[PDB]
Subunit: 404 residues, 3 copies
Amino acid sequence: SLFMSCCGMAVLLGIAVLLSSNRKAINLRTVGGAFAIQFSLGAFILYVPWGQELLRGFSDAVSNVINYGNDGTSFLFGGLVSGKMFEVFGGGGFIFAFRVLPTLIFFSALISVLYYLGVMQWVIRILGGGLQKALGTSRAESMSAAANIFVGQTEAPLVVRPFVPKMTQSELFAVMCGGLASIAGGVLAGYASMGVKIEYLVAASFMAAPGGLLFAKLMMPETEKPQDKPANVIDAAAGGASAGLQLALNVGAMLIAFIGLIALINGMLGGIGGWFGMPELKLEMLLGWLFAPLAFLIGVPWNEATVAGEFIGLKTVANEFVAYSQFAPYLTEAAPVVLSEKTKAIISFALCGFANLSSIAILLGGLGSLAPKRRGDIARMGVKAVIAGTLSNLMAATIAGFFL
Amino acid sequence: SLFMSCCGMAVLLGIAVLLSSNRKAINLRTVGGAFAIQFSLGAFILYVPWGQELLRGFSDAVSNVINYGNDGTSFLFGGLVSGKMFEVFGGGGFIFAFRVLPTLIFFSALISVLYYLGVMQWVIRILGGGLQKALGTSRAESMSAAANIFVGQTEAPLVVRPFVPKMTQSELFAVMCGGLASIAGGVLAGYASMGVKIEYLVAASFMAAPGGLLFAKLMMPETEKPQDKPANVIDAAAGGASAGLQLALNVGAMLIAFIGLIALINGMLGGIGGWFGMPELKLEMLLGWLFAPLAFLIGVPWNEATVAGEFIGLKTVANEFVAYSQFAPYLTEAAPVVLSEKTKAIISFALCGFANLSSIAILLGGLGSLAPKRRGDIARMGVKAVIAGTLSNLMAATIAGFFL
Amino acid sequence: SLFMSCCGMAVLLGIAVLLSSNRKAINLRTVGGAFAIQFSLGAFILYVPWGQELLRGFSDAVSNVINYGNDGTSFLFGGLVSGKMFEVFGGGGFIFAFRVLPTLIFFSALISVLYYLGVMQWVIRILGGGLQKALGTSRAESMSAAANIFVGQTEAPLVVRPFVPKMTQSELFAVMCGGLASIAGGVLAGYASMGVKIEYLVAASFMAAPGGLLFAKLMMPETEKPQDKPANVIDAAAGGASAGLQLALNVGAMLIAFIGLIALINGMLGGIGGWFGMPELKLEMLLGWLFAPLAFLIGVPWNEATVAGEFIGLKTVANEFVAYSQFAPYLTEAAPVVLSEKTKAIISFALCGFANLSSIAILLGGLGSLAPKRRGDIARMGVKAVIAGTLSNLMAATIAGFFL
Ligand SMILES: CCCCCCCCCCO[C@@H]1O[C@H](CO)[C@@H](O[C@H]2O[C@H](CO)[C@@H](O)[C@H](O)[C@H]2O)[C@H](O)[C@H]1O
Ligand SMILES: CCCCCCCCCCO[C@@H]1O[C@H](CO)[C@@H](O[C@H]2O[C@H](CO)[C@@H](O)[C@H](O)[C@H]2O)[C@H](O)[C@H]1O
Ligand SMILES: CCCCCCCCCCO[C@@H]1O[C@H](CO)[C@@H](O[C@H]2O[C@H](CO)[C@@H](O)[C@H](O)[C@H]2O)[C@H](O)[C@H]1O
Ligand SMILES: O=c1[nH]c(=O)n([C@@H]2O[C@H](CO)[C@@H](O)[C@H]2O)cc1F
Ligand SMILES: O=c1[nH]c(=O)n([C@@H]2O[C@H](CO)[C@@H](O)[C@H]2O)cc1F
Ligand SMILES: O=c1[nH]c(=O)n([C@@H]2O[C@H](CO)[C@@H](O)[C@H]2O)cc1F
Ligand code: NA
Ligand code: NA
Ligand code: NA
């Protein structure tokens, strides 16, 4: 029953303690409250009626903003994003390049506008402030964790840019973990446009802030002592659009290459596997077989653990975007394998994070430019930070599966 | 009758004098001849039969070059830019991304070729020379004003690059104004492809050179004393294509975001306005209500001033590209509001300029890279330069409305 | 009969000797073996049954990898790259932008992966080693020649990056020639997707390594004495995808502009030619008339020399991509002129090279960044290097025509 989920949470916590830089330095108030907040946040918005309605209200607003942004997309690509496409090409009428990627551009511009207006800083200041008061975490790392709810791993530390170079190793690690445990407002809308339930995306985003601090302070407790704009709104929007464009181009090229490379890998695996009586061997089977125990531990039913393992493994060995690209068909009526609604939720939560090895190089560049003398520390803590970020996503999935 | 237009010209002139840095320093020969040239140029090509035929001949040549350039576009996107699109998707068969944006690439390559060959420098030298002889303006600022007829605000000063750092404040201001009062050959073809009459675009482009000098020397008279390549033609074309590509990408991302943001703004305005019994409230209504007097002043009929105000206001608060994107449907048979041919012309002229606040940041980067120690002056004069550029566009529209 | 081909080879060799920096410094072992290898390589894979089967086996593998990579393309553009496009738009259903350009992205990512794994370095070390042992060429220039079989002119010298600044002038020239005589794995797949026979592309690529050294050591003999990474595999793929994206964008913009410019040139040539009773005058006719003797010399039949001259000339005056874009329709059933299979092969080989004037500027940037103090030498030897590269392509075509 629910016992398997509670065991799941315990195992995830235990692994973090086992990988800790110093278990005797672990602050019980910090890691105790962090888990408490992430657990309670999950309980509130996924179980408690009022919180469920607040989540639903927030998600529908996000859904409306996406539709508003699609007017710009409709202007540029016209009939290629109209209903006629489904009449002519059927399911192939949904052109990913024109349906999903332009949303990254619109949302990046929007976020930039909300930063210029001070709306973002206002929300981050409140959320980040509440975290440090309850957990005893430092001012800077708490703000970065809260900022990561809405923006990406390289953009979130910008709210505390001047404090980054003199951050303690534990602070720097938490900052890295905050980004790895979360996603970004831009791609959230993208994943939502792919069929992923907005409620899950919004929930996982908010739960990433305490979850990121949780596993950061478990695996890298504080052993040191911490310390302590565009000309107009139109310029802000333009700057965001440009950043979104570059992101859209990068994501699109990555998807073309990685999905293509997976197909090539599967072709080779067919020949190699055939030598062992397994000509049907594919990458999905390997990842499914290898990540099935992990999926089962976080609450996925026995008969759905292997399929769930495919996406979870793919997210880890590559990135969450590619994983979502393969999981999205399972959210439609044309799903090759009909999964339970709880399993769908677990996969959605467990995928909702930038936690992968390639994000280390991203952190080295973006976060490293803010503090060039700390690039050595970032590379040194990269793998552990990814692990911490992965555990945070897994914990969020286990919690979500519990109240569902 | 025509009295309203003459009042319009007077008001525009008066505002410039009211905003002058020193009215007693205004050179009557300079600003008198500048208005005379812009007025006579308008009279010649819009009223006088011979000039009308020369304008028509030039516009058709421009129309032919665009069709020639569309062969490259047709090669890349094939059936998606063919007539079959209109059979399948109807009006939505016109894909803006593939129809309009690639023209920016072809024309940028062409302009780069005409620069390598010396054709551009030849024309600019003649036009710029005639301006300084008649107006008494300096050599450098006259060439920049003439260059702005064909190229953008950041590219035009390149013809006098080494003279920019030591320019007087009045010279630097005029250079800024020359770019703000005009557009570029690349986007001109884009706007033409959207349905905007080429004759109006060509006319407004040429009239921008004296018009830009007019309001620059009215608002910032000279109080000081002025002073005074690719390896081959194929490389030139390639360089232009690359520049055009970057422009095309920037414009496309901007349009997706801004049009999307306008839709979001209208959604919010519907709720906010509803609190005051105006749930139908939209951005177009605000801009229309606010810019209707200005439209009426430049010659737009009373019953068309509000609709004309929508586009004029949008051009000012955002940019001319977005404005043209909303005005283009009014140039087709499927126009939601059938406007008079004079009103169509007035709007076309009044929109034909880079005069907006966001162009200040553009000038800071492009023009600023030519003279890094003058970036402070550019930012200081930015708003006034935009105003001067706006007045120049408005004057051109009033003149156009007069002879029509 | 075959006598015309042997004369062709002799003429090409003679021209190189005539243009030599020092004929008495020409190493007979080097240039004798280089021609021997290129000739024997051609004989082996185009005539000898076993070699023909090895070429066919390699080409089919390349064909399979391309299809695998098209899965990523199919994901992004859906129905726009499906069979339905041919039902709706007929021949125009083949959208070049979505069919060909994305292959550059996938293959660039793949090559980057094969570099990270050490597979590329392994092959290059063997091929490059065999060349220097047989020809007596230096270690560095032999590796660069072998690397150019698979990658582009700017990427190939990276395998010997630290040796480039101290290279002899003859070494630097050979390095330039190796890149000009060949293409790249990315665009090879692109040309293959356009209908160009993979066997010819693969053959020309391998034959470029000895061919490049041949004409480099003929035109610039050695008169001096020579001397002597991404964090993980996923990062490698991502880096390659990004590089491929930039390449894809550059190629697409170039094609839009150049094909558009050719159409404009033809429009002007129609008017100019009309003054001399030739209103049908076009660029293709000029290039065809001018390059027909050259085509005839390399083995193209008399009645097909003019048509063959169009593409060969276009490749030289512009680039091979544009040439292939005009030659591709002649490889289909809807070919305006049905050409012999030997003529098709000759054109395919003669076009398979980056040898053009615009590549000089490319070499100045890419190869020049590896040795900034040698940019003067690169520019000085640019034209001769292009000639050498052109002769190498022509020789490969003549050889191919001989055994066919
Ligand atoms: C898509 C389908 C197929 C999936 C295939 C799975 C591929 C996963 C292999 C990952 O390889 C490792 O990744 C690390 C992370 O980058 C590297 O560490 C490098 O970077 C670390 C992080 O900074 C450092 O700690 C290390 O010292 C440094 O070796 C490490 O060398 C590398 O071997
Ligand atoms: C699209 C639909 C919605 C439309 C909404 C309308 C938005 C317009 C607001 C413009 O805001 C102002 O723009 C100036 C121009 O950038 C800024 O001046 C800044 O830049 C100037 C120019 O250099 C300087 O003179 C100023 O000192 C400096 O404050 C100024 O601060 C800023 O408040
Ligand atoms: C597409 C259809 C139409 C086709 C039209 C054909 C155009 C071909 C003209 C080429 O022009 C030459 O190209 C050289 C190569 O770049 C230039 O040399 C320049 O660069 C060389 C190479 O480094 C140097 O040796 C030279 O000194 C330097 O002048 C040279 O000046 C330039 O006149
Ligand atoms: O804002 C972003 N920042 C970022 O780094 N990414 C990277 O792109 C990958 C795919 O979304 C993520 O795993 C992450 O590594 C994506 C983003 F959308
Ligand atoms: O060449 C150009 N230069 C330029 O700055 N722009 C900018 O892009 C906006 C939209 O066309 C213009 O208002 C102007 O600010 C556009 C151009 F086409
Ligand atoms: O890898 C490449 N490197 C390169 O320089 N190019 C350039 O792009 C032109 C068109 O393919 C080539 O002639 C060559 O000059 C293309 C490439 F694909
Ligand atoms: Na984040
Ligand atoms: Na201009
Ligand atoms: Na090469």
